[PDB]
Design a protein around this ligand. Structure first.
Ligand SMILES: CC(C)c1c(-c2ccccc2)[nH]c2c(C#N)cnn2c1=O
Ligand code: NI
Ligand SMILES: [Zn+2]
Ligand SMILES: [Zn+2]
Length: 577
């Protein structure tokens, strides 16, 4: 009944194209960008060894119920719609809390609490820990007594209201043993050898099970796992191992996902600055039917994914130009509710069958990732998928010259939602501009174009705030203060270039895009806390414009300077020799 979408393109690069990944991805960008994802087959000779032992590799498995994997179900949306309207009426506003890294599922929580007789029934019987368990929450972290605090503050008033009448007060595993699991599950399900069941068939049965309430199918995966903590599946040199000469090649390879962030065309390179949270790969161990819902990467940008081994991983891509369009059809499901909770759209996980996105006009491509293959995900390309059987994958995010302007556009969208930024985009740009040499000329060029847009935009914000009646101007070093203390009162964005402080709070802050929301305090005295005085314009635009236009003239001892300045080659250098 399910229809496989069009295949996304694969690239089988020569050993010479395979030498720089970020050059090859640029080569391919104008094309693969249109499918939103692409697959990359390294040369068959390229087979890096698997660093990790398996027999002892211990991870904590998470769980997925494919029946309830979909959070955008009709019932959950009308509940949350009705709950928000309720609170709106009460003068408050519905604010959905986060519990253990992710949003609290109120519909589940409310259902469960009410099935055992409600708040004071669960309280007096101390079953709140039983609840959080059935809600999928990891013990013994005390989530139980935390949910009670949340239910009361949020669901109890609605419980009363919805309940009869009422409502007066008050108010305001081992990788080895995992393979044994996943190979046993799959064979007993399809009654074949696990390697013998065709991709098309598992893909069909997967989407069947999602919309199928006639049967429950539970599955285990593991993720939120780092190279830092558990170690990379790749060889690489830090202190912990003598590296074998057989491995020496692959340890240094640019396709080793440990090395990508530091490649000269990567942004997270020479900045010796801060943790972005993606300079380091993550690990996904997977089963048959294990899935990952529709999503884009933080700050959009790129993700590359190597399947080290095991049965294949199915992907569904969407172009970056279809992104607004994608978000729009999902929004059609609760327009009133998504108005009040703009970011709740992203917060709610969904696997919307590609078939449904297709008939709404959204391009959806796909592919089967087979062991030893790379998948690249382009900026703001929505992706999702599932695993065919037992496997082990490794992925990192990254950023490139072409991304920079997208990254700025992302903050602006993260600013128009209420969304915490995982770092400051503008801070990044200046850290790059502050070391113009030994910076890829691609970046430098793009930086100038991108920085001049900020200087203008900032000066507009710097002169717009004085009309508002601020006088005093302090000077702070923002990068050195923790991210959550440099946020904006309601934005909520990380400030670098400038912000506004009053005496209403010793530290509470607002970016120049929302000056009126700081406090009721009249303009009167101060305080515009800035970073650079406007002596920045000549200074930093110079250093970057230097190496930017030094290369422009050089193309228009000449093969020496290119080696000293670390110019790229391909192309031009070929004519040289
Ligand atoms: C099944 C699970 C281990 C999984 C998740 C995943 C894990 C936990 C929560 C959400 C997704 N994400 C991803 C991506 C991406 N992007 C690629 N593969 N992949 C996975 O296999
Ligand atoms: Ni992803
Ligand atoms: Zn703001
Ligand atoms: Zn004030």
């Amino acid at each position: 009944e399910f229809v496989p979408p069009p295949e996304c393109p694969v690239f089988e690069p020569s050993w010479e194209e395979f030498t720089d990944p970020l050059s090859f991805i640029g080569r391919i960008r104008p094309l693969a960008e249109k499918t939103g994802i692409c697959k990359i087959r390294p040369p068959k000779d390229w087979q890096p060894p698997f660093a990790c032992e398996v027999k002892s590799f211990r991870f904590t498995p998470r769980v997925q119920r494919l029946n309830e994997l979909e959070a955008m179900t009709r019932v959950r949306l009308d509940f949350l719609d009705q709950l928000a309207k309720f609170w709106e009426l009460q003068g408050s506003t519905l604010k959905i809390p986060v519990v253990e890294r992710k949003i609290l599922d109120l519909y589940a929580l409310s259902k469960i609490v009410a099935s055992k007789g409600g708040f004071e029934m669960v309280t007096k019987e101390k079953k709140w820990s039983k609840v959080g368990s059935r809600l999928g929450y990891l013990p013994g972290k005390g989530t139980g007594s935390l949910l009670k605090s949340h239910y009361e503050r949020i669901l109890y008033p609605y419980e009363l209201f919805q309940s009869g009448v009422s409502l007066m007060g008050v108010q305001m595993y081992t990788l080895q043993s995992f393979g044994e699991m996943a190979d046993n599950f799959k064979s007993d399900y399809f009654n074949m050898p696990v390697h013998m069941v065709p991709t098309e068939l598992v893909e069909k049965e997967f989407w069947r099970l999602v919309s199928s309430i006639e049967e429950d199918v539970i599955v285990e995966y593991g993720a939120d796992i780092s190279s830092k903590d558990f170690g990379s599946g790749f060889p690489v040199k830090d202190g912990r191992r003598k590296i074998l000469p057989e491995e020496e090649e692959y340890a240094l390879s640019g396709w080793n996902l440990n090395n990508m962030p530091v490649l000269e065309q990567s942004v997270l390179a020479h900045i010796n600055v801060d943790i972005s949270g993606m300079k380091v790969p993550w690990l996904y161990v997977g089963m048959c039917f294990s899935s990952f819902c529709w999503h884009i990467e933080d700050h959009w940008s790129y993700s590359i994914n190597y399947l080290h081994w095991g049965e294949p991983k199915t992907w569904y891509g969407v172009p970056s130009h279809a992104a607004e369009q994608l978000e729009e059809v999902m929004r059609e499901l609760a327009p009133e509710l998504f108005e009040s909770q703009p970011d709740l759209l992203h917060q709610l996980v969904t696997i919307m069958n590609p078939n449904v996105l297709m008939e709404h006009g959204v391009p959806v491509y796909r592919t089967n990732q087979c062991a030893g293959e790379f998948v690249v995900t382009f900026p703001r390309a929505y992706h999702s998928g599932f695993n065919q059987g037992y496997n082990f994958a490794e992925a990192v995010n990254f950023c490139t010259a072409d991304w920079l302007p997208i990254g700025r556009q992302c903050v602006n969208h993260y600013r128009r939602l209420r969304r915490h930024c995982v770092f400051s985009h503008e801070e990044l740009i200046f850290k790059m501009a502050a070391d113009p040499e030994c910076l890829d000329v691609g970046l430098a060029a793009m930086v100038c174009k991108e920085l001049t847009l900020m200087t203008e935009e900032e000066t507009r914000l710097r002169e717009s705030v004085v009309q508002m009646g601020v006088l005093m101007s302090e000077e702070e070093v923002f990068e050195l203060v923790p991210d959550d203390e440099r946020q904006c009162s309601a934005c909520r964005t990380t400030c670098f270039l400038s912000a506004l402080t009053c005496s209403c709070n010793p530290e509470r802050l607002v970016c120049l895009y929302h000056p009126t929301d700081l406090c009721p305090c009249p303009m009167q005295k101060k305080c515009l806390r800035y970073r650079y005085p406007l002596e920045d314009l000549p200074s930093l635009l110079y250093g970057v414009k230097v190496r930017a236009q030094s290369y422009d003239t050089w193309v228009s001892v000449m093969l020496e300077d290119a080696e000293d300045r670390k110019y790229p080659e391909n192309d031009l250098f070929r004519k040289l020799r």
